[PDB]
Design a protein around this nucleic acid. Structure first.
Ligand SMILES: Nc1ncnc2c1ncn2[C@@H]1O[C@H](COP(=O)(O)OP(=O)(O)OP(=O)(O)O)[C@@H](O)[C@H]1O
Ligand SMILES: Nc1ncnc2c1ncn2[C@@H]1O[C@H](COP(=O)(O)OP(=O)(O)OP(=O)(O)O)[C@@H](O)[C@H]1O
Ligand SMILES: [Mg+2]
Ligand SMILES: [Zn+2]
Lengths: 48, 235, 226
RNA sequence: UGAGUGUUUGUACCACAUGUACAGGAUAGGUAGGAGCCGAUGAGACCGGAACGCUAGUUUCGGAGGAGGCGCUGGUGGGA
């Protein structure tokens, strides 16, 4: 089951990115180091 | 206790889907469901250990007495008395209070306001949990389940499964709670010990939620039965 | 069942009728039939439930006219703080070493007041004072850097007010010997301090019932507005 | 669109009764006052009945009798 997901910056809680993932292949919340435009630096974003 | 639009999904397998429940006060609720239904998970939500993915779970401000389904032995060398004593926050507050006194000597006129406020609450809180409990607990074992004092000085990890269940149940009572969340309170008890637990829960005036796979045990106590469905993911 | 004196006092009193403040103090002075200088105490039943941490109240209020009884002071102080205690005239001046003798000795001192630095050493004795309740409490102001204010307040008649678990907080306003006006003034001071002490989380009417009574006399309901 | 009866109730007054763990003299509900209090307006102690009861005892009514007991104090307990 592949679903659209939102990656939110952990630092400022800003829903910066939209992506998608297969729940079965990745049961746990995804986490990626992405650039947060609000904070203007690379931060850890975790699916919401 | 109330929950609305409850949602919870560990990975791909979901537990609650738009589940709801309202429990009135002073209700001896018997929680029933197959293994994995999510009975233990409900308590974790009540204890705020878990958070619903979506929805609101509402709990009263009253103090909650929680009896875990599995015994929590932080260290192997912990003694039964240490384990039981940890039920009450007397020791924890005293350690904080002792440190507050240390800061008072070090700090003259800087942090006194914060320290003085913290000290006052600890004393008031300590008195609220009257420090006479040291004697009450010693006799709570006797009147509760005929727990011998030789066990009182023995490491908890060395006790038998039935003995551990008695200690854990006594620990819950030692905390003097307002709401009872019992997760299989008679898992290992023998016939004689189960008798005491039943009588106390019948007499217990407050609200008590019981997760049990013992039908006869529940029937003697339960007035309201909450069923956690495994297929509909509802309550 | 009831003594004739108490029955006579009862016929003077009217349970249904909640007297004004002046009426209540006068009626208490009348009701204390027994021939000794009995104390006058007022009981407030606050709506708050002390079982809640915030709700419970514990403080100390200075009474301008005093309690009608002198109060022995024990001061735990060292060096300059001991000098402050000497100036104030503490009934006992001691230090971390004098606490050991104080344990079992010089008991019945009305209130203990220890310096912050001293509290760390004083706490050991305080655990003994704990059950006695004598241990200084910062919320009441007993624990203080300077003891001069504490000692003068004790002499002035500082009263420690602590709500009971059931929500009824009692406090002696003054002796029957005091003039009814001074008792009423002390009662008014008690009323104001309770209002200021009303916790934020409290809702509804703050006080369920106010009663005044002497050590011997019966209880007399008193109007809160008065 | 109003009267009553009765039953069943949820609530608030008002009376009543209960408070027995360890130790402690022993049946210790909390808080505050409390050295003095109470009894020919019939005390102590005795006896029966009734109640409660943890089985220890306690609550209370009564028969007689007529003047006493109780508390502080003392130890215990966290608490008298
Ligand atoms: N962190 C987790 N990761 C993956 N699955 C989980 C996690 N936590 C719980 N689950 C699942 O939640 C499901 C139900 O939760 P819960 O443990 O409360 O069931 P239960 O009814 O209390 O079990 P039992 O009655 O046998 O004691 C479990 O079967 C478990 O598989
Ligand atoms: N490793 C151990 N070290 C010290 N004492 C132990 C040890 N194991 C058991 N004991 C003691 O042996 C006694 C009985 O042993 P056992 O484990 O067989 O109890 P049991 O018969 O299984 O009781 P139940 O299963 O109902 O809890 C217990 O008092 C237990 O505390
Ligand atoms: Mg479970
Ligand atoms: Zn960000």
């Amino acid at each position: 089951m592949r679903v659209n997901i939102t990656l939110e910056c952990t630092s400022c809680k800003e829903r910066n990115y939209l992506t998608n993932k297969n729940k079965r292949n990745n049961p746990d919340r995804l986490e990626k180091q992405k650039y947060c435009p609000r904070e203007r630096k690379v931060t850890l974003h975790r699916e919401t | 206790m109330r929950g609305q639009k409850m949602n919870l999904t560990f990975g791909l397998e979901e537990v609650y889907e738009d589940a709801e429940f309202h429990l009135g006060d002073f209700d001896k609720v018997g929680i029933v469901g197959v293994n994995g239904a999510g009975k233990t998970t409900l308590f974790r939500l009540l204890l705020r250990e878990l958070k619903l993915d979506k929805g609101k779970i509402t709990i009263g401000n009253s103090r909650i007495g929680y009896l875990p389904q599995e015994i929590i032995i932080m260290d192997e060398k912990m003694t039964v008395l240490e384990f039981l004593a940890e039920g009450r926050p007397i020791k924890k507050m005293e350690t904080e209070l002792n440190y507050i006194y240390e800061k008072l000597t070090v700090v003259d006129d800087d942090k006194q306001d914060r320290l003085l406020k913290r000290m006052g609450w600890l004393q008031e809180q300590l008195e609220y949990f009257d420090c006479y409990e040291a004697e009450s607990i010693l006799l709570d074992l006797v009147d509760s389940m005929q727990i011998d004092f030789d066990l009182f000085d023995q490491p908890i990890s060395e006790l038998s499964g039935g003995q551990k269940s008695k200690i854990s149940f006594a620990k819950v009572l030692y905390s003097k709670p307002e709401i009872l969340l019992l997760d299989q309170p008679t898992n290992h008890l023998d016939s004689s010990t189960k008798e005491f637990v039943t009588k106390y829960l019948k007499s217990y005036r407050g609200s008590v939620l019981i997760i049990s796979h013992d039908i006869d045990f529940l029937n003697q106590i339960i007035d309201k039965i909450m069923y956690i469905d495994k297929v509909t993911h509802k309550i | 069942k009831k003594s004739k004196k108490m029955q006579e006092a009862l016929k003077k009193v009217d349970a249904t009728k909640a007297y004004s403040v002046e009426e209540a103090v006068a009626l208490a002075k009348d009701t204390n039939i027994a021939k000794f200088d009995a104390t006058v105490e007022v009981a407030y039943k606050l709506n708050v439930d002390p079982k809640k941490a915030d709700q419970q109240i514990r403080g100390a209020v200075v009474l301008p006219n005093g309690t009608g009884k002198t109060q022995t002071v024990l001061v735990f102080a060292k060096g300059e703080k001991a000098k402050e205690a000497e100036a104030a005239g503490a009934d006992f001046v001691g230090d971390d070493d004098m606490v050991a003798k104080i344990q079992g000795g010089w008991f019945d001192f009305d209130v203990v007041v220890a310096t912050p630095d001293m509290m760390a050493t004083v706490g050991k004795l305080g655990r003994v004072l704990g059950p006695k309740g004598l241990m200084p409490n910062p919320k009441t102001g007993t624990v203080t850097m300077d003891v001069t204010k504490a000692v003068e307040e004790v002499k002035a008649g500082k009263v420690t007010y602590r709500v009971d678990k059931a929500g009824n907080i009692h406090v002696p306003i003054g002796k029957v010997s005091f003039d009814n006006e001074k008792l009423v003034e002390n009662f008014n001071t008690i009323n104001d301090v309770l209002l200021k002490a009303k916790p934020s989380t409290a809702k509804g009417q703050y006080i369920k019932n106010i009663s005044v009574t002497t050590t011997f006399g019966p209880g007399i309901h008193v109007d809160q507005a008065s």
